[PDB]
Assembly symmetry: D2
Homo-oligomer: 270 residues x 4
């Protein structure tokens, strides 16, 4: 019952979860369900896709076709698709929640630029948990980070291709900044053979790849005699679907500006 949303990528891993997350969320209605033209346009929506009910909400291929059908557009697709939707939403004040990744500089640039006519939440990671952990780790670095050893460990399924995750990296920068240094001057990503002694001031990263682990991140601050650990474990991708939808909702009343989860979660004044 409020704000309607459109879900681009409706049959992809993220669009389904996004449908379930949307229904399930209150204060949000499911306006449109896009997919691209050429697929089996997998039975005009419903629980069709999102294994849910049925919903007279049926998947489509046309942006202008639905224009009056949603208020906020949520995208977890591909940079190229995004940029198109971006142009349309921008044309007709339609807010975006964007979680597609891998833009090039030009990519990102359109986004900030579309951001003065529409309201956009753009974020790398939409898990609330993760966004809080990043805030915590700062504080934490404030008082313990200094004199404590700092090591980040992250585990992911056997098909993740980049080591150490992007979240581990953000964790790393979050801290290094806190200590007001540069991640690049103090990071160590590998430890094989005779290393000699751990170097004070660095931030080691350890990386585990196995099974279907969706994502676990732990930050450690070790002194002599005690350890503080802050771990975030994602159990399923619903974790981002939930936080995308929460932000769609938060966009309510919002005319324009570029935002992220700190904005949504008000981690700022926190």
């Amino acid at each position: 019952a409020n704000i309607r949303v459109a879900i681009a990528g409706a049959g992809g891993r993220m669009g389904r979860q996004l449908i379930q997350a949307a229904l399930a969320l209150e204060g949000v209605q499911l306006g449109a369900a896009l997919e691209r033209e050429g697929s089996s346009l997998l039975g005009s929506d419903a629980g069709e896709l999102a294994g849910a009910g049925k919903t007279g909400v049926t998947v489509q291929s046309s942006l202008d076709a639905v224009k009056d059908d949603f208020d906020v557009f949520i995208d977890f697709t591909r940079p190229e698709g995004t940029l198109n939707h971006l142009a349309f939403c921008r044309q007709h004040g339609k807010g975006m929640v964007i979680g597609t990744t891998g833009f090039d500089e030009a990519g990102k640039q359109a986004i900030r630029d579309a951001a003065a006519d529409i309201a956009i939440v753009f974020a790398a990671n939409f898990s609330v948990g993760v966004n809080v952990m990043l805030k915590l780790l700062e504080k934490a670095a404030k008082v313990m980070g200094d004199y404590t050893d700092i090591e980040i460990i992250e585990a992911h399924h056997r098909h993740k291709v980049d080591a150490p995750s992007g979240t581990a990296l953000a964790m790393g920068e979050a801290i290094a900044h806190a200590l007001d240094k540069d991640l690049k001057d103090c990071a160590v990503y590998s430890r094989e053979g005779h290393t000699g002694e751990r170097v004070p001031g660095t931030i080691g990263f350890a990386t585990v790849r196995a099974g279907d682990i969706v994502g676990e991140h732990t930050a450690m601050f070790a002194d002599i005699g005690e350890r503080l650990e802050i771990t975030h474990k994602a159990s399923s991708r619903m974790t981002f679907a939930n936080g995308a939808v929460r932000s769609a909702l938060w966009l309510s009343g919002k005319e324009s500006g570029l935002f992220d989860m700190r904005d949504v979660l008000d981690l700022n004044n926190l």
Copy 2:
């Protein structure tokens, strides 16, 4: 080389660690080393006790004997001993770092009262780690605490007699307050047989007792799809010795008032 400290309880589990912690700390000198009269007054100090060097600093039995020998008094003994030292330090402006526990109301009351003539740091738990975790858990409860399930797990050695630790309890109150409720209205300490379903809004506590674990505390905030955990592991009692000494030092320049670790660590503005 600065501020000298006296260490009451010099041959007890805490007084040794406290000697090592003191030497090792910089900006602090070891002025006096008390024990009570009647013991083997275990070879007038040194590495004697604290397995350290030797130090022309030799253990004693007389408060007035050392009065000019230390500036700050650190006590991890017994309420009764404390109250005495308390009276002496109070007489002659001598600051206290107090970590003795188990006062009765009258106990605590003398303390606050001695607190207008001398400067005292009185704390239940002097581990920095723990004190930060407690600050974090609040913040955390702020944004996730609400709609997330909250469970505290703590492990301790097989001779701890009270379940769930005092730290778990403080963890619990730290949160419940954050959510602005009462720990007493929402706590669950045991789960045996047919419980039926977990009740939204409660804070379960699980308690593990085994071996020589000095102390591990984990707070969990579980949603559907993700978990944030904040764990503090004490590896040795040096963790409190360190933070007692850090507070002794912090007391420098301090005339009077009652304080604790939030004060020492400035967790306040944090």
Copy 3:
């Protein structure tokens, strides 16, 4: 391409997973797909249900209807349903893989009795992982169990109603037997207030209930100076679907007898 299986409960939480697990497994074909008569008999199978392909394999309501369609019958339904299927399979030598739980003594009794005419794998827990852990914990108890403190911790989602899980309980008995004692003479399930000291020889159990955790079990053997932990984490119910299907397959060539996972996994000679 081999052995066909029928999946009773085809639209329940377990029957879908069981369909996916079956296709995906090799050396196994999907013969029949039952549901009971009266439901929306959720579109005669396929990826219909198990979000899979389509499969000319369509859900049904009639046991005799499919009799020539499967070789082994897999049941994760209700005791009452089971007992029926049981009678049919027993009539016409059809092997069972049974994972339905909660029989009464009479229940279990039919099962052992059907077991001399057909081959049945009956198990409480069909996760391979868990079945290995239970074997390990014995061995383990053999050499460390004795003089080490033993504590079992288990976490499950907020709608589990019985504390401490059935797996924790089996873990407990697995050990107690190893030490050749009785679980009932040495178990402790709760620890609230002044407990006094941990009692040598007992097996404490700690129980965590939160979010959507599907199931985590940890067994601890703590001495002075070291801890051995054996943890099994279920990430999704596919873990049992997989092991049910593996047993269906194992049943190949098997005329009759009652078996379980130790049999399937040959944990016996292990």
Copy 4:
């Protein structure tokens, strides 16, 4: 009250623990306490060193001086020292428990050779826990190792110089053998940048270095839907002192042969 032992290295990190472990153990008496000639020959033993009692047992510098004073010799010193003691014990049938590491091939060779005249327990790691875990991990690999991803994670204090520990390496070989392959053909020790996908069949190792962690080892076997983890956490070096002393005792009645913990712990028939 039985078997006396001599402890070479009596003031080193290991010799003290070894004294405490010895007294504390029953069925073992403390015969001699060596150190080398030139040190402060730290007050002829007692709780002197091992912070224990006093013991008319006083530290020495002469092997022949004590020859009638102990039955079994325990060494955690240096290869060079070892080789000497080795020659003496060999001369006069005196059993050895050896935990000194870093021999060269010639080193090891003397040992096996001294092993036909005296009885020696020679082991890299004397923690019982670790020795059981290694046995478990085999079994485990037997049934799950194959099709599961295998990752070893180990943490150690900030002054350990070799990555991945020797225990992680032994863990690795223990498994690889189980699967009957070669550790060297399937190990991966580092994961930095674009790795591409995890390769089936390898054994990744992740390495954490921080604070004063004495040693934590975890072996993981991950499938789709479940994980089995076997973790061993050393809390203090007493863990090896205990197992050295247990082996000294086990040596009782033993004339000659080369042995290790599997022998002591009978992990063989296990």
